[PDB]
Amino acid sequence: VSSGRDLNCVPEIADTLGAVAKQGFDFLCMPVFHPRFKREFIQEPAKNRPGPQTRSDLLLSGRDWNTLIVGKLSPWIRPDSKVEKIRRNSEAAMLQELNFGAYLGLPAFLLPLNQEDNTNLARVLTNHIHTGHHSSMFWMRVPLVAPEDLRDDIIENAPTTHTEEYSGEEKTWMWWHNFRTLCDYSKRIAVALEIGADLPSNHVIDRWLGEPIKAAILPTSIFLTNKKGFPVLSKMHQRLIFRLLKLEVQFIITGTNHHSEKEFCSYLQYLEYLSQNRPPPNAYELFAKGYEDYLQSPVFEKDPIKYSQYQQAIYKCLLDRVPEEEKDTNVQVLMVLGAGRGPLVNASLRAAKQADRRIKLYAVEKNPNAVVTLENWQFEEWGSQVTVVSSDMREWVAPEKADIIVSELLGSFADNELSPECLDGAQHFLKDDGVSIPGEYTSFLAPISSSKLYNEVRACREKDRDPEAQFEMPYVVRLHNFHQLSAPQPCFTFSHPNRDPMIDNNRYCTLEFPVEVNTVLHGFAGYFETVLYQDITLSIRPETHSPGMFSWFPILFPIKQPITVREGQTICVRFWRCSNSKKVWYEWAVTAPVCSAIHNPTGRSYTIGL
Amino acid sequence: LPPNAPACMERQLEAARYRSDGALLLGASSLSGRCWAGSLWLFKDPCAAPNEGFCSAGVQTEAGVADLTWVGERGILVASDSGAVELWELDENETLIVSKFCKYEHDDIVSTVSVLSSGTQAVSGSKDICIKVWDLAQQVVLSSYRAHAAQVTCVAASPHKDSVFLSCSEDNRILLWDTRCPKPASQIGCSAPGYLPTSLAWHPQQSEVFVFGDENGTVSLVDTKSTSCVLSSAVHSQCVTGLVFSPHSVPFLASLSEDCSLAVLDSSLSELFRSQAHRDFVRDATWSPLNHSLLTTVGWDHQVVHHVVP
Numbered sequence: 050v051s052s053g054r055d056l057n058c059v060p061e062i063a064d065t066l067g068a069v070a071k072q073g074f075d076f077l078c079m080p081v082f083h084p085r086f087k088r089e090f091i092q093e094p095a096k097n098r099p100g101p102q103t104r105s106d107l108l109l110s111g112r113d114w115n116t117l118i119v120g121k122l123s124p125w126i127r128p129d130s131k132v133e134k135i136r137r138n139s140e141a142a143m144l145q146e147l148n149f150g151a152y153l154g155l156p157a158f159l160l161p162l163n164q165e166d167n168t169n170l171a172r173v174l175t176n177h178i179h180t181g182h183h184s185s186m187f188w189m190r191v192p193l194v195a196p197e198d199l200r201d202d203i204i205e206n207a208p209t210t211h212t213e214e215y216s217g218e219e220k221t222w223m224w225w226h227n228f229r230t231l232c233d234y235s236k237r238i239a240v241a242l243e244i245g246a247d248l249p250s251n252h253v254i255d256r257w258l259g260e261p262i263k264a265a266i267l268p269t270s271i272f273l274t275n276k277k278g279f280p281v282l283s284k285m286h287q288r289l290i291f292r293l294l295k296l297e298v299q300f301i302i303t304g305t306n307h308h309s310e311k312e313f314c315s316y317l318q319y320l321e322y323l324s325q326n327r328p329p330p331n332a333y334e335l336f337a338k339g340y341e342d343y344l345q346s347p348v349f350e351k352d353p354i355k356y357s358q359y360q361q362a363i364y365k366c367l368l369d370r371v372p373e374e375e376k377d378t379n380v381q382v383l384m385v386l387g388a389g390r391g392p393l394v395n396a397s398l399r400a401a402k403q404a405d406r407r408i409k410l411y412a413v414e415k416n417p418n419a420v421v422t423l424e425n426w427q428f429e430e431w432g433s434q435v436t437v438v439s440s441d442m443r444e445w446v447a448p449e450k451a452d453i454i455v456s457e458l459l460g461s462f463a464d465n466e467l468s469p470e471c472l473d474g475a476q477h478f479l480k481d482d483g484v485s486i487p488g489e490y491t492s493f494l495a496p497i498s499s500s501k502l503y504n505e506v507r508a509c510r511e512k513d514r515d516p517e518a519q520f521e522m523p524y525v526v527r528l529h530n531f532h533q534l535s536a537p538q539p540c541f542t543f544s545h546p547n548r549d550p551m552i553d554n555n556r557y558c559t560l561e562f563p564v565e566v567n568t569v570l571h572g573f574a575g576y577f578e579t580v581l582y583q584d585i586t587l588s589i590r591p592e593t594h595s596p597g598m599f600s601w602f603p604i605l606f607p608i609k610q611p612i613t614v615r616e617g618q619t620i621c622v623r624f625w626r627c628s629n630s631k632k633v634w635y636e637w638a639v640t641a642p643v644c645s646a647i648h649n650p651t652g653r654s655y656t657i658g659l
Numbered sequence: 660l661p662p663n664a665p666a667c668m669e670r671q672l673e674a675a676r677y678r679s680d681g682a683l684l685l686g687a688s689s690l691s692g693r694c695w696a697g698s699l700w701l702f703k704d705p706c707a708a709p710n711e712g713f714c715s716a717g718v719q720t721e722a723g724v725a726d727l728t729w730v731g732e733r734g735i736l737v738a739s740d741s742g743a744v745e746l747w748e749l750d751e752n753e754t755l756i757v758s759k760f761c762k763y764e765h766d767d768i769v770s771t772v773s774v775l776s777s778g779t780q781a782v783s784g785s786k787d788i789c790i791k792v793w794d795l796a797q798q799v800v801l802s803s804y805r806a807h808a809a810q811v812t813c814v815a816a817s818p819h820k821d822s823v824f825l826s827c828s829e830d831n832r833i834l835l836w837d838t839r840c841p842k843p844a845s846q847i848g849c850s851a852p853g854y855l856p857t858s859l860a861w862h863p864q865q866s867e868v869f870v871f872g873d874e875n876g877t878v879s880l881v882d883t884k885s886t887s888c889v890l891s892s893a894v895h896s897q898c899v900t901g902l903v904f905s906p907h908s909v910p911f912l913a914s915l916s917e918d919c920s921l922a923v924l925d926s927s928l929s930e931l932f933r934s935q936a937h938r939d940f941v942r943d944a945t946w947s948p949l950n951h952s953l954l955t956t957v958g959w960d961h962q963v964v965h966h967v968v969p
């Protein structure tokens with residue numbers, strides 16, 4: 050566990066850092082200038098105060114400042130104070146403390162969010178960020194519950210607000226939201242979430258899903274005392290620690306030792322005890338460990354579950370097409386479209402031996418690089434049973450019509466998004482009673498909230514192209530720090546073979562998503578369900594997800610501008626699957642609660658080459 | 660200088676308290692440099708201050724001193740940055756200052772301390788938003804109160820009532836306390852929530868009236884029973900850090916501020932005396948019990964000024 054110690058009192062910088070390192074802390078959160086040292090910059094004679102203003106930078110090595118010390122803004126600095134004199138002094142002091150932090154080369158600086166108005170605090174910080182490009186981080190100290198809603202009910206004439214306040218309990222998230230909106234979603238500004246004695250309602254903690262949390266501040270006061278006499282945490286407090294550990298945040302310990310009979314190391318020992326006693330990561334979690342939240346613009350042989358289903362689908366199709374009395378006289382002609390390296394071809398052969406039936410295989414692949422792998426396979430192992438087809442399928446005439454056409458939906462050798470158009474142009478060399486594998490597939494859409502992902506898409510602005518083209522294109526992404534706002538609904542379905550007189554792959558779907566929580570819409574997550582044969586299916590939809598299928602990740606359709614969504618409101622999405630004669634593209638827009646621009650019109654930012 | 664005492668005194672002087680015999684207690688803290696520690700000093704000769712070589716007693720604390728208060732005639736209550744309330748007992752010969760107890764109970768810097776009328780109990784206000792009632796005999800915390808929403812700026816014990824004390828914080832709240840009530844805190848509010856309260860001072864004779872200074876430099880005279888402001892004056896141009904009454908039968912009010920100036924006011928809050936002697940923030944002020952016309956002030960400029968109020 051990466052952890053740090055928060056101290057507002059450091060008399061000897063060399064001795065204090067050595068003491069916290071002995072306890073097992075990786076870093077130290079300390080003030081760069083004395084917290085009580087109130088400076089004057091405008092009024093005399095306090096303006097001409099003889100120096101130094103703080104401790105020398107030579108008291109620690111450059112390596113120690115860059116890895117072991119996290120900056121802390123002085124508590125007296127109030128840039129949004131109602132007094133003009135305090136406002137101007139805090140402005141000059143904030144710059145003085147921030148510039149000193151950059152002079153030391155600190156990896157992170159702590160600034161507090163303890164009120165509704167932090168506009169001038171945002172203005173001064175944004176100016177410091179735009180004055181020379183740097184990698185220095187800024188951790189915003191925000192509690193889960195405001196201290197006004199945390200106070201003891203001991204004031205006689207002014208008692209605590211006992212009434213229900215759904216939006217009032219989420220006021221702390223709005224302090225952070227308004228601040229980062231003012232700073233124009235800067236990647237250098239993160240959340241240092243402070244956990245109160247009594248946790249708020251689950252909906253308040255759910256607002257922080259998809260937020261850039263880099264630190265978790267845990268005070269000594271929230272720690273309970275066990276039967277032995279050691280610092281522990283409640284089951285509800287432990288639940289949040291397991292959630293925060295998955296987000297890979299840096300847990301910070303603040304306040305004096307309340308369990309005085311045991312040293313500060315006991316507080317850290319419990320956090321390291323929780324990480325060693327957490328639920329084990331599954332095959333899906335262990336596969337994509339470094340691929341978390343990293344979005345790629347639109348490995349496969351390493352998934353055995355995927356081809357096991359294809360093998361079972363062909364095995365079930367063969368038995369249903371040829372009875373036990375015809376297991377030698379009737380030969381089933383199978384056509385593998387987009388054969389690639391031959392995993393679907395091998396799965397087709399394994400199924401024939403399992404069903405004990407006669408098969409004639411045709412490995413179709415346009416990519417000549419993959420044809421080398423197939424032709425080496427059909428000479429060293431397969432033989433006369435498999436006939437590799439590298440010719441242009443539109444010109445090439447089949448010796449006989451196929452019984453079963455087997456293909457993959459997504460893959461490096463598959464046609465991915467162009468699966469309907471390619472299967473429609475392949476059903477001509479298929480028999481009248483012919484079966485297609487997969488026979489059917491449905492796409493699913495779900496509204497998501499992720500301020501972290503929106504900022505990652507925002508960072509994808511490239512030169513020599515539209516400055517908003519990054520929002521008008523889908524992304525393959527491992528959905529980690531995000532929040533699904535509503536249950537995924539079916540968008541469009543395709544069936545193969547399609548014996549329709551007028552085959553049109555153009556689609557237009559309208560989906561209404563009911564949202565029972567206050568949130569901010571950042572985009573839409575795309576999933577899919579596919580029927581290979583009868584009950585045998587493959588799915589990336591979280592509800593019906595195929596166990597151990599890491600080969601396919603969900604797609605993401607982002608929106609140029611985020612949309613505020615209230616409790617009870619409905620998100621209405623309009624999706625278009627557009628198909629021309631030369632290209633195919635996706636167009637999307639939001640109509641409720643507010644209207645958005647039609648994304649990717651005429652496929653200007655994204656198009657799949659037909 | 661006496662044994663155990665440090666060779667040099669910290670530049671920033673935070674507290675100056677006159678003992679009933681005439682001796683002066685000094686609280687210095689290091690707010691800049693290599694070491695950010697604090698120190699406690701005693702001067703039987705007030706004119707000898709701030710010179711280290713001519714002092715009665717001296718000692719160095721682990722961290723800087725934020726506030727100080729006399730515990731009878733030999734005890735010294737310390738509000739430390741370490742988040743601990745320290746009690747330093749004076750020697751039988753009054754030459755050494757020994758540490759009786761150091762309890763780390765406040766999560767942040769203890770900014771203000773006030774001994775309750777009995778002299779066996781004391782109250783502490785810290786940046787951790789908490790207020791604690793301490794027992795000076797058993798060295799423990801009797802009650803831990805969290806009524807405020809921001810850092811507790813000032814705590815002032817009632818002159819003769821033990822259960823009664825005042826507390827103010829950056830949440831614009833002035834609370835009148837009474838440990839005899841199930842709900843001890845009572846928000847003694849004004850007609851309009853103006854500027855943040857910074858200093859508190861109980862009246863010595865009238866146990867029902869008090870004075871408070873705000874961050875805008877205004878000092879207000881407020882009665883507890885009337886629960887509304889009747890008289891106030893713009894005394895300073897910057898935050899009022901302290902307010903101290905004289906030992907007179909009809910006391911004079913000494914106002915301290917960050918504008919580096921001292922001010923002495925009457926019952927109608929009108930100015931009588933003003934001193935620009937300090938070139939830095941005026942921290943503490945104490946009237947001599949021997950000479951009621953004499954007033955000693957300290958600041959961050961390492962100056963110990965002795966004034967003669969007319």
Ligand SMILES: COc1ccc([C@@]2([C@]34C[C@H]5C[C@H](C[C@H](C5)C3)C4)N=C(N)N(C)C2=O)cc1
Pocket residue numbers: 347458459465466467468490491492493494540541575576577578601602603604624635
């Ligand atoms: C609502 O618009 C969407 C657009 C594309 C998709 C899908 C496919 C995959 C597959 C089956 C479906 C048809 C074709 C082929 C596209 C969905 N494309 C990718 N890369 N993913 C992961 C999908 O699920 C999903 C939703």
